[PDB]
Design a binder for these strands. Structure first.
Ligand SMILES: Cc1cn([C@H]2C[C@H](O)[C@@H](COP(=O)(O)OP(=O)(O)NP(=O)(O)O)O2)c(=O)[nH]c1=O
Ligand code: NA
Length: 342
DNA sequence: CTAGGGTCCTAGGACCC
DNA sequence: GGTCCTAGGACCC
């Protein structure tokens, strides 16, 4: 009853694409991210930049202090999506059991594969080698009996490498595995787990499920399961997008409704264009807006609405502006749509 | 000195029986 | 007791 799961994961995806398409960027620190004047953050960075401490989600101002010579690139999302479509077509050569998680990564369920003598290790190697050919980007991979171990595994031999976890190896791997390494355990959850003396899966194994359920809800059942290598989530190839959003951080805050309305006027065609690619008649389940204020508090307001409509987004943003603002400056404006259920 | 694309979970009151 | 509506938050890429 044991499954073979591969998690395939592109190395420094956006940056690797920019380096292939401009070899001059190979050995200098580079990053995709908005400028400091735009109040941007790092999307990702190459290994020369990471050597200085540059990380995804880091404010560009902090990145540049760590790495004064950092080259900042705007990002070319159609180039990234083209690489994505190609690696996914490569995955299909081995199995239809493909669950994309993002542009640059996917789960593959190769249990019923008879490629490469049924070896998931060699299938993962072949996909990585085929990706390096054909695209001149490198990938890493993880091979495990369940999703989350495969995903942790793909990080352990990166870049351009892989790691395999057999069922016989699962207990020793789990024993000292930090909880923070479990997908879905973030900074807040790890800090809370740490505050009750839980750091590793070995720690959680010695815990009562009932306590975890009280203390954490359904997440605590996930914690109890993962700490034991239990992860029955199937590789699902039939997931569909449920929302589409378009939002903008300004280079400095706005304090007048006229400015907000102007922002909306430029955002709305972008929202309409992306919605129409997937829903030509613009028919939707809800639409709404987002403001992010001075104190970084965020409010959304969204309602049932049959079809993308600019004026109603303006009107509801005006309400949000007047009501839930309380005189602060505004750093971000966003528009949002919730897609119909089929 | 804090993006923009998203997913999933929670929870109170409305609404229904 | 269910289920829908809405707002917010943690989290991932
Ligand atoms: C974590 C992260 C990623 N991205 C974009 C840019 C990344 O290149 C792309 C894939 O995300 P990964 O977490 O896999 O990071 P990576 O750049 O590919 N480096 P890796 O080699 O460690 O996987 O997704 C962002 O825009 N913001 C992010 O916070
Ligand atoms: Na990656």
């Amino acid at each position: 009853g044991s499954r073979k799961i591969i998690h395939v994961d592109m190395d420094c995806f956006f940056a690797a694409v920019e380096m292939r398409d401009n070899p001059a960027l190979r050995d200098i620190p580079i990053a995709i991210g908005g400028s400091r004047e735009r109040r941007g953050v790092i999307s990702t960075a190459n290994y020369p930049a990471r050597k200085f401490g540059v990380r995804s989600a880091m404010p560009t101002g902090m990145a540049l202090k760590l790495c004064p010579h950092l080259t900042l690139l705007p990002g070319r999302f159609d180039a990234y999506k083209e690489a994505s479509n190609h690696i996914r077509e490569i995955f299909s050569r081995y199995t239809s059991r493909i669950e994309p998680l993002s542009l640059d990564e996917a789960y593959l369920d190769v249990t019923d594969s008879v490629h490469c003598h049924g070896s998931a290790t060699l299938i993962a190697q072949e996909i990585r080698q085929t990706i390096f050919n054909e695209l001149q980007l490198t990938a890493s991979a993880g091979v495990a009996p369940v999703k989350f171990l495969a995903k942790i595994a793909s990080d352990m031999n990166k870049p351009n490498g892989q790691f395999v976890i057999t069922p016989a190896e699962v207990p020793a791997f789990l024993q000292t595995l930090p909880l923070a390494k479990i997908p879905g355990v973030g900074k807040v959850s790890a800090a809370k787990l740490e505050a009750m003396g839980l750091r590793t899966c070995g720690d959680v194994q010695k815990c009562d499920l009932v306590m975890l359920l009280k203390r954490f809800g359904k997440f605590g059942r996930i914690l109890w399961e993962r700490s034991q290598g239990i992860d029955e989530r199937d590789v699902n190839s039939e997931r569909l997008r449920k929302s589409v959003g378009v939002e903008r951080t300004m280079a400095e805050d706005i304090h007048h409704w006229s400015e907000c309305e102007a922002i909306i006027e430029r955002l709305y065609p972008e929202l309409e264009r992306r919605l129409a690619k997937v829903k030509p008649d613009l028919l939707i389940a809800r639409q709404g807006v987002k403001l992010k204020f001075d104190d970084f508090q965020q409010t959304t307001q969204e309602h049932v609405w049959p079809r993308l409509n600019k004026a109603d987004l303006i009107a509801t943003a005006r309400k949000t502006w007047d009501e839930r603002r309380g005189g602060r400056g505004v750093r971000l404006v966003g528009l949002h749509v919730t897609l119909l259920d089929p």
